[PDB]
Write the structure tokens for this entry.
Amino acid sequence: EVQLVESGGGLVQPGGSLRLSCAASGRTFSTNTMGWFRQAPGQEREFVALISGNGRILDYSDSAKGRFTISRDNAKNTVYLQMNSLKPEDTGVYFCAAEFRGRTLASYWGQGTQVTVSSA
Amino acid sequence: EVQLVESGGGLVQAGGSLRLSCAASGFTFDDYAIGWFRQAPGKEREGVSCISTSDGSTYYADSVKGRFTISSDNAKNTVYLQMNSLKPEDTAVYYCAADPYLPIRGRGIESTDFGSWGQGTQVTVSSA
Amino acid sequence: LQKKIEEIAAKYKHSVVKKCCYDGACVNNDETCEQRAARISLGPRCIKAFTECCVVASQLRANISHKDMQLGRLHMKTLLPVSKPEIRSYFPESWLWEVHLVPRRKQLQFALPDSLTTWEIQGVGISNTGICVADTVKAKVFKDVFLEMNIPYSVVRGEQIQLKGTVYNYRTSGMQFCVKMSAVEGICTSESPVSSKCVRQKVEGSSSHLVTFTVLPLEIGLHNINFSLETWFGKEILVKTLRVVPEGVKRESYSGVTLDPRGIYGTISRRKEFPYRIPLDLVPKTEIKRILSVKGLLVGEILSAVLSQEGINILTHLPKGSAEAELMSVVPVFYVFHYLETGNHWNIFHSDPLIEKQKLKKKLKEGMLSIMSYRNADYSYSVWKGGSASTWLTAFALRVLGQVNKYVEQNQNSICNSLLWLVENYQLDNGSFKENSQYQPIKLQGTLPVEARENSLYLTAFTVIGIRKAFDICPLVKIDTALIKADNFLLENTLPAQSTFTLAISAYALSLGDKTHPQFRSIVSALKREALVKGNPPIYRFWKDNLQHKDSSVPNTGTARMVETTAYALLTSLNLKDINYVNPVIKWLSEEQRYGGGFYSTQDTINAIEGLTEYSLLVKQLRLSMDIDVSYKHKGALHNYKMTDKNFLGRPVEVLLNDDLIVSTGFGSGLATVHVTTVVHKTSTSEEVCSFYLKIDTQDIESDYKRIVACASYKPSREESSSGSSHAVMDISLPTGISANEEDLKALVEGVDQLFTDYQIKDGHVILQLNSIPSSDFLCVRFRIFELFEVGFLSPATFTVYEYHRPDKQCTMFYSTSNIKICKCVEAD
Amino acid sequence: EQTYVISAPKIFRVGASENIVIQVYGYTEAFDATISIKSYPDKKFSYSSGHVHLSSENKFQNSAILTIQPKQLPGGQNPVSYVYLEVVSKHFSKSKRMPITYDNGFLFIHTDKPVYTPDQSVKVRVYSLNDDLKPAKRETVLTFIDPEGSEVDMVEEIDHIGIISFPDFKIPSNPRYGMWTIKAKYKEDFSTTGTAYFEVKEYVLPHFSVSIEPEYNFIGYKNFKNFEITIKARYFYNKVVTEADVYITFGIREDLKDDQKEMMQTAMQNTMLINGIAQVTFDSETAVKELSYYSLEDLNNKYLYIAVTVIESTGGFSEEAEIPGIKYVLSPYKLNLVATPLFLKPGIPYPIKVQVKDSLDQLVGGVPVTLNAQTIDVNQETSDLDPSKSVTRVDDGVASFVLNLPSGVTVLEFNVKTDAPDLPEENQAREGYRAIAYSSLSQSYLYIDWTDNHKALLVGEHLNIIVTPKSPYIDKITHYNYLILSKGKIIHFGTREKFSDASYQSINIPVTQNMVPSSRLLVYYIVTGEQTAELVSDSVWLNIEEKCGNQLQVHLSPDADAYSPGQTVSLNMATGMDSWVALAAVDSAVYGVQRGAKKPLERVFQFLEKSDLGCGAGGGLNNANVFHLAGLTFLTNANADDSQENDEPCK
Ligand SMILES: *[C@@H]1O[C@H](CO)[C@@H](O[C@@H]2O[C@H](CO)[C@@H](O)[C@H](O)[C@H]2NC(C)=O)[C@H](O)[C@H]1NC(C)=O
């Protein structure tokens, strides 16, 4: 059962800091491209950034230009997205994806993790 | 013309020894096989031995195995058939023959192979 | 003389034009210069020089005798080309590659190989002091009296065949020898001399002699003959084999069945009967070859093909000249590996799983590095060696290599270059794709405008499939935009379907991508409407080509196109995750499969294997514990098969006794596949349906030899247009005792005037592969033949023409060179 | 006056044990000194150090073994290019800057055959060594390269013993043809790279074999007017072609590696081959002068490529053969200087030894030799001496020469030629050379030589070297000192006393297994002038026979030359010590052309000799150049070495 249980994320202040490490929970993922989506409440998953299975190819969505610079480690099959810059509009259950088969959709999906930018 | 001259022979007693030679001329000596035959009076011609010059390998006609020994001389073109232990069976007029082709062995020297033949020499052994 | 052609050749000074002039100057009596120039696809640039050089060469060969006719060709053979790397001697694989530890004294024992060769043995020793190189040792294996026999590959029973061989003598002096033949029971030596006596002959010093024997076969395939060479040095024995085959044309009929007692997959099947059918034209004194295979899974046949046999047997019988065939070598291995890895079924093996996994990975790498020969300079794939790059094969191999990248890493730069070439260089303004070469991958129904439109749609959808498969290696923006444009093309101009094949391919290409668009749902519904169903409730469900063939007509004969469309519909249904609709389709496809696991052609085989593997992987497999027993109808029984998940790759058992066959099962879970193949021999083609106009005959020339001229042409159906056929293959069997002259074929292939794309000679067959066979007129191959040895009562050979990607459209004719009347065992019973 | 000399190899090797020799003269009692190695920027990092104590019983000579642990360098991939070497003592302290290089080991790639055909397995193994010529277990990575230049696959393997046997490379069924390459390297830190080449071609069935045989493998001036070429056609083994037509074409080739050649538009044609043998006569002068360079001297060192085509009249079959080239030579003799340095010491005779070889690089004796010389003084005056004449020997093949040249000469240029009777003038060999006087401030020189003829330098046999300090006007010398280097490392150092009565002194030196392939000897002494001390030095090249440390032999028990197919045979391996053996049994015909059949076993010694850092046959411009040419660098007070600008290649 190839699963992509999410790790990282939680509560944050506007201008705070956060970081997620999408950790694999099954079959190896060395060469398969992995990336991140956005799940703004009410709407559904929207592309943010992706990086290939070698690391030489990267893509950033226009909204998130790379303020959460993407990397990945193949020893533990983990994908690091470092959201330092945050504002109360990045709310939504963020999603990390399996081999992409294009740009959106992707093959295997995880349950996601909730990140809330509380203004308090 | 090719020529083979037989020398030796004579009268011997049972259990003796004798030396015979076949001087060869008129052909390339290293490219021939030379055979010793016998022809008893009143009997069909029979092959006795053969020597292959190019390599020195020998063939003895079964019943005469070990009894004799063939050795050639590259210097004077003469093969020698070392007739040792002359038991009274031979009593023949043994001939020497030459042929450019080695035989098949196996079946043997018989069927009267060879194309160049000599005059032969008479060898007699007495049981006295 | 030659100066006139040399003037132009060395004055143009162009790399491409020089070769065009060179092969324009080649001798060709059968066709004119303009006809030769008509086939050139390089452009006018060297067409001018080709025509000029052809005219000059024709003019200069009028008043010259047979002295300058070779001087000119041998002067033209040089300084126009650079070189072609080519060795004419074959050296055996080296032995003694071991590495040992020597404690100052070691001894090994072995045996020298059977080869008259001067072996050089060397050794290097390393230790804490350093490295030392020992003196080389020379050991020459040399046999002074030798007998080499020339045995033809195959013969047909009923011929007087003479086999001729050589007696080699390395001795210095002259020597006379005896040669002996051993007679087997099933071969009449025409004398029956059995010892069988001898005919003593003579050879000179360091010479050789030629000795011939005359025989005739009675049984079939008698592989035990002895020859004895008895000389002054003794007797030597040489053993040779002779393969004898009957007359006619080989024909294979296949039949499958799927057994599942529980009925989980739609139907319950416990007994299946294959009758023992004797066709009308069965050759006398020839038993019908029947083979049965049973496997414990849907992909069990592929597992038997890959794992049970150490070497990867080719799933089909098609020629290997094209790059597509060389690529086909990796697909079954990949699908087996994918099933094993994703299903985590490594526990089936009893040995260490890691070693077998590494071996399979190395085999994948073997295929991956074998396909590399067809890459061009711009990382684009060519259909044939040195031919023009084609987007069809580029997309196909891109899809396959993008698949392979899942388990074996690929060069990212190479895939990036190929995928960016096929997007930028060849793509329309509206999203369609253009082919570059003339490699027609399929002949499409309708008139010429409809044909072009359907060709564009099919190529676009195929390329979309490939790109969506190989996106992960090189995810870029421009290629994504091109993919979106092509998807829009498919969405907007797919629905008015002309043929169900294009509709099915477009639906599958769309399913992998966006499946929310309502137009895709309309396309899927339109595809689902065209389904043909046998059985209520549906037990068989399949598709076909439906332009005007919408009448309910199921000939029950599988065709490459039919299997292709059915597999694409199956993949669409799987990708949409619809299981209730899919069971009859997998049932039909599993019943359709052949012995080795490969279907009729290649492009249907890959898709069908992918569909079956993905169905097995998605729908979770059940535990295998099942009892299958096969028995004849009136004769005795046969081996009983008890399969678990620990044994389902059982050895294939050939049907020996002749009776109707019945396979029965008990109560058990899982699925079982039973496939029976029938290889038989026939004596005519009138019963078959021919689709190619054919005529083959033999002429005589003027040293003079015999020549063979064959001609073929396409017969289009009512639906098809008159543009010709797609990539076609012509097979010529040669009569026993003669061979084909290779120089003529090398001339017919290796020039810019190529009448054919590839040629090869395998197992006594001359196989030629061509881009298109015209329907308006006849296209003819012509070549000289050489008489290897004299033969009598020679059986006629066959001449076949068939399309590459759909072998159903085939035509065969019996032919012979000459038949004139010639007491020694001539009457074979 | 007291002086110290620190001697070290010119370039430090990372991970290798370098021998630093400290020799102090003019001191008494005893003291300790530390020789350490530090980083370039700040003297903070100390890679290693060595503590040595000098006393009377040690003869004030000492050695240290320093090493740069490859992990102690900075972890960044940017290499460190310079490293400080420091000597600290109670009486003195000094520092020097030294370049380092990462080329540490040797990677030999052995492939079974040089020619392959499709569907064949390539069996490739690798021998890996370190700077000490030892197993050197390190993981190795090797890649294959097709003719186009694109890497096909890369494979890795750990090293256990010293021979790394790698998996095979199954040639594709329809592969790309040409000159495939194999590259091997280490994984982690070292930069050593080994290269191998192998050729891939299709296999065709030949109709009948055709072989070309020339008069020789060279065309001297004997065969410039007529050259006999014989063609043989055979069917199989000894079966012979009966009748055929033959055509021949000739061309001029620049070298054996250029795929292009200048063909000839006029050539012989239409030769009737009968019974598989035919003969043709080629006239170079007629066919070349009218169509190409007309001077017979312009074709020197360029080949004559021959192409024959034979067409069987009966069967109509065509076959071709080609001789790639025949080496044109203007003179059959070549002169090479041996056992002579190119820098002369004034006031001492300057011996010259020429060596004459034929066209096949084989010694030829009895050839007369004539030398002429010109001398230019420091005052720019040119004077010519009388010609010297001698005859070369028959065993060594060397013509001993002597030139009793004056004391003031600064540069001597000498030309050497042969005076063979038969050869007319033009066809004689000539060679010119130049020698520059050793330059010293105190007018102190030194000349050393080892006296022998037919020089072999048997190992285990003592070497007697004559040292002649005859030169200085302050000739009050207490000791001589000598260093002996081999394979780039200082392996011997010593000091010998001086006999105040005689000038020339004989020094006896043992020869050991650490000097097998080649060695360099350096003898120097310090003269104490009224101004400052002065080092004066000289160098000599010692060639020693190629002898292994184990010298294993492999034998077959039935030593008869001819065997029979399938016959059982036993291979016996005998070594002088425990070792690891790797075998290879190949077809002797795979090497094809018997000329220039180079195997890895043939090139191993030549590739292995690259470890010697020095260059030249001895001598030097001055003391600094003598130390630099020998592969050494020093730290003293008498003379400062200029190694900052010294990174140069030598022949
Ligand atoms: C042909 O040669 C083969 C060589 O293998 C021989 O076959 C032998 O047949 C006998 C039958 O009695 C067996 O016992 C032997 O084991 C076989 N092999 C041998 C002797 O190597 C025999 O000489 C010939 N066989 C036939 C069928 O003709």
User: Anything to note?
Assistant: Residues 226 and 283 of chain D are 5 Å apart (CA to CA). The pocket of ligand 1 is lined by residues C 182, 184, 224, 226, 239 (CB under 6 Å). The helical segments of chain D are 284-289, 600-608, 623-629. Chains D and A do not touch (no CB pair under 8 Å).
